[model samples]
Target: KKNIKRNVEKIIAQWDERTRKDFGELTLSTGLPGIILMLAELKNKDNSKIYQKKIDNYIEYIVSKLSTYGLLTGSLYSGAAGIALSILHLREDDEKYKNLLDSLNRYIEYFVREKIEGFNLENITPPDYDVIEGLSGILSYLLLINDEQYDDLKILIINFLSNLTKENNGLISLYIKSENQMSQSESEMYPLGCLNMGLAHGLAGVGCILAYAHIKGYSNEASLSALQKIIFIYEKFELERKKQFLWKDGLVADELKKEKVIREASFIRDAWCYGGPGISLLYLYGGLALDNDYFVDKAEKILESAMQRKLGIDSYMICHGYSGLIEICSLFKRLLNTKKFDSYMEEFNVNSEQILEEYGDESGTGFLEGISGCILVLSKFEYSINFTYWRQALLLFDDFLKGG
Candidate 1:
């Protein structure tokens, strides 16, 4: 017997029901939906807790909803909803969830399936809206769930990156087929917002795939190259920042603030916006994955800075958006600051539970990112799935042991 702790088990059961009790805009953002569904499956691991049946009830209800599309029926929302369904399938090992997963997979397949650079790729060419991200999620979902989709994914990303190159940073944020060049349309696509920022998220999504692909024994060179491109862009952007972060003049802060939207300076910068915790996590992943020490240093400083300001109270006033708050708490855990970490985490949970219970029935208005944030917070608390892929495994491993 592993000897499950009763108190911990009780807490988990309540937490599990809290994961998907269904409140406001839960089906927004592909990643947020996935987070809700991912954490929604915390069954009665130790058989303790008055709310144990409630947790089970909620999971079953959500699973049924997915099969029936109860809470899912939007464009980008579908992508995340599908990922959520997939996670449910994985967590429970149940065929019901499995069928839902398959249905969602087919949905993405039909939706994303398109012609890319003269090839039969699942994603449409010339990414539009959050379609790029939608496709990115679908690509990963397919690769993980169905390997036959791998070749098409490869062509999609390759073409995506190829056309992504701009003469500026040797990369492209968004590319046009006719132009065959990175789209610098800052009106619609500010350079940094387009190239550095969006690319950063795209890179992070790819980084997640890389982690999985590598674990599954797939070669990760192309993914590394994409991440490396992001680092290079950041480096150039950093050099551009000297005029900002270290300008002997008073213009530095203001200038740096503007530049940061385009480039990432440090943890202390405005990563709260465009770069934020999620993108920062992507950068940290690339840095750790590609042996980029500069990124490691940057990530460490960001964690250190975040840890300094963390207030894990019962406020529920989550900082850094939904997944962002999760990334922040995760960094707190990475720094080995559990007590301090939980202090803020408690506030986060209280906030989420209160919102769902009070306003859940209102639908599409409460906490847009609440479910994911809840899932993220709980994951950090229990060290469920680390999402902690740093630069050098050995170094980070040693630091984890040392509680850095």
Candidate 2:
């Protein structure tokens, strides 16, 4: 019930300024999730014309910058894939839509043909986990349309999966090596949980794509089964464990204890949770692990509460606060797939206007990151594993890591 007023506005403006100067043009690992919320707004809801125009402007601006800078790495590719899918959904069959898909297909084909040489998992490449996110997105989008448009991309998906799958424990080992590098302070108890959550995403994509491939005259029972197992593992390990970790804003209960924050079960994390995808995993697990409806209900409540908080003036200024808003918006559309929540149009416009007035010109790629973050938080709403599956990629990729 709090109004943001002027004081919080000043803090937000200052932080935006700092972020703009330091972050540069590329979006960060954290901000990419916002596209889910933004996409939902543009495609699923009755977005206001002004809001749609602004959102499109944001995309046009970011895409132009990305193309100009040659940031075609895994993160950008995944983002490009997501943005393209979203644009297709929004504009449907437009030339812009076709071009986006064409670009992604070319990238996917390069990876298939070039192997490790295509997109290295290190610097220009995504972290080990990002490949899964990117591939899955590309594969799923192609499958959704039942289009053979990205045939080479499909080969790349399988190759990427095969290379990673052929590993010692495949993804599990890779993840473990990755997680081993984190310091106890940095690691605490959440790495495993986060990894599980990420794996669920990969599983969902792999599963869906494999299923689509099977349906399309490509017959491989083994591949299909393997993909199914990936999803099953995600459900068994990731989805079932979500309730145990239910603390707000992506922090789990155990992790919250380490942070000295009083943990409560709440709906705030959905904005950060990828359109209730994690909850969907829980439902797929079945057996004693099956309480899908209850969890979904829990998520909905958290989202609704988050929406109310976001509607307040100052709430957006708090760190990850915009996610609360984004999750609320995402949940409203995703769960019900309804336009009922569009009732707050005027209030949101006023709120956005205030934010622009205070800190609109902040610089660097942080603005893109900030805008993305804001989209996720305010608009509200990944998958993967590689390595040992026992560890997180952070340990292997980041030399500074020291495991908890």
Candidate 3:
């Protein structure tokens, strides 16, 4: 067994610096996932007092920054929704966070009641995919925290999802044109003009959310059947055929388009500033919920692949690496080859810490991202994703927030 020292300490150091420096202004897409997961792990530690205090302060800090509607900026609609859900998961037992949650509840309630419009296959609201992603985050949290308390809200979300789901294909399509002005109209199609990775991530949310609903007895037979078919499509077409296309960059085109330079390139581009792990988290949750070995194996393979990328000591992608490790450990907690995991963790630490030591502040969101990544690596000792059926997905969601 390899001895890994200062893992948690390094995380704490990064969080202390970055949270204080960029407290109210952190990016929702990456910052919340990292910190939420970090706090989750720390809360379980015997020496958690200092980390607990920091988590509390960070909670208050985020609560203070919520918009009147209980939303955050610095990220798109879906990213903010995911962050809000993570924060709520951490703050559920605290009365102080209730009012803030209420604000979010009200916003979602309004959207569901007033602006749901309709769903289509070839055409969808520009932000429909984003909204569904956001809604999944909210529903996942609600179901986890207390589905009964949000019964009305849950019904509203289900209705919205019912309309949003299309017969065009089993998977949620990110390629639809929008009917609402709330989101922009689309101009281009998927990468390589045929394959879509964003849709895969979005469908990941759908599958996982549906699994949660089914496990909670809130899902209908139709939805359950649909989820099964969705998983089938995901496996047959996307997972097996497109694995090569879905890289650290969101998507890879089959071929280049001369007329659509930016559009095609955008499909395969890596995240420059933030958010490298969100899609991976989607896969982790979706695959776990569906009990699909393909996605689980894919998650492990992708994470292992990331280690070889050498994205720098302080790169945001390192968070992706750690997050992937956390998921694999959780899913395979019972059978994990810790000897191997430890070796990988040691390698990660050596590369990660060295980068931090040499690069100082040049690490671009690496320190911020590492806050959660390190926590995941540090908290591997007691990780669990064995809650029965899809219940594991809910715990994974919370764990992901904490750093998984």
Candidate 4:
């Protein structure tokens, strides 16, 4: 309980006067919305004397920013602004912020009409990035509001995703098309005689699909089947690597080949690393949905390994962000109900508390990321914000500070 109070104070203190004063400018600007939302969640979780004051302060700052920013106009920032606005709307029944919602609606309409990529596969020709993330944010907010006006967005996104699915294993393609004739020495794409498509990208894309299905009140068979196959791919890779502690980076596939067969990474490749916690979170909720113990058990082992990694470290590297911490806490809470890993939970929290004590009240690692890590870790102690759908989809609306 003492550690809980200390950590909560740390999270609140980190977003102090300096951070607030710099609010529409830099990292603080981009991070403030998430901070406010987390505070909003905290306000809902417990209305104690400590949090009630902090919540008021945060809400005042946020609403003030909204009055100035007018819901922003950029793609990513505007999306996040809309989400924050929506959450604020949930918290407050004030009609004063009605204009903010309208502004968000306008931004979504403009982006969907102009900025969205292709509705058909024929238009895509080996793109630099995927549209799954961009479109998914819009869908999340639409679902959050239960707005039927943007229902067409869901159909369009599903159509695009369905077209991108490969028939062999029900996995979505990382690219629109494969490039052939490139060897390891020839290009960055071909690291091991195949094009390197990351498992994280695929898994996260699948997560978006699952989230959409959960909110939309219907399931896409192809997406579900694809999820099962993806989990199978992960299991196969885990078996071969014998590394329960870390996740395979991605599959190396000879995309140029007629059949497009893929192979999982034997170790963390140079391209990208999906460490233990990363894989754990992806499979954790999925396993919960499907009632698959294999996925759940594997995630448990990976998380234990992650906790073990934290034992000796005075503070974690900046790479360990809030995203992983939130998922870890949420998963642990879910697992705790079964009363299986009491000792593991104790040790995990002790190590987590130490790390948060050192870094929770600082912007050195990263303002938003570190603050968010604190929020999630402390929540486990019943000292911070409870996780919710809005928090889950908050990051999808990435990029830009767009003022406060």
TM-score of each: 0.55, 0.47, 0.60, 0.65
| Residue 71 lDDT, candidate 2, scale 0-100 | 42
Q: List the residue pairs that clash in candidate 3.
A: 36-401, 36-402, 37-401, 37-402, 37-403, 38-402, 124-178, 125-178, 126-178
> Pairs clashing in candidate 4?
none
Root-mean-square deviation of every model: 9.2, 12.1, 7.6, 7.5
Off by over 4 Å in 1: 1-41, 44-77, 80-86, 89-92, 115-133, 140-223, 239-273, 306-319, 329-368, 375-404
Error of 2 at 64 (Å): 4.4
Best by lDDT: 4
Find the number of clashing residue pairs for candidate 2.
43
Q: After superposition, how far is residue 17 of candidate 1 from its true place, in Å?
A: 15
- What TM-score does structure 3 among the candidates reach? 0.60
Clashes of 1: 13
Question: 96-132, model 3: which lDDT tens digit per residue?
Answer: 6676556656665565444444544465433443322
lDDT of 1: 0.38
Relative to the true structure, candidate 2 reaches a TM of 0.47
Error of 2 at 108 (Å): 4.2
lDDT tens readout by residue for model 4, 184-216: 332344433322233223444445445344434
Candidate 4 residue runs with Cα over 4 Å from true position:
1-30, 41-92, 97-99, 117-133, 137-142, 167-172, 176-201, 211-216, 235-241, 244-246, 255-273, 288-326, 351-353, 360-368, 383-391, 394-404
Scanning candidate 2 in windows of ten residues, the lowest lDDT window is 387-396
Q: Which candidate wins on TM-score? A: 4
Q: How accurate is candidate 4 locally (lDDT)?
A: 0.45
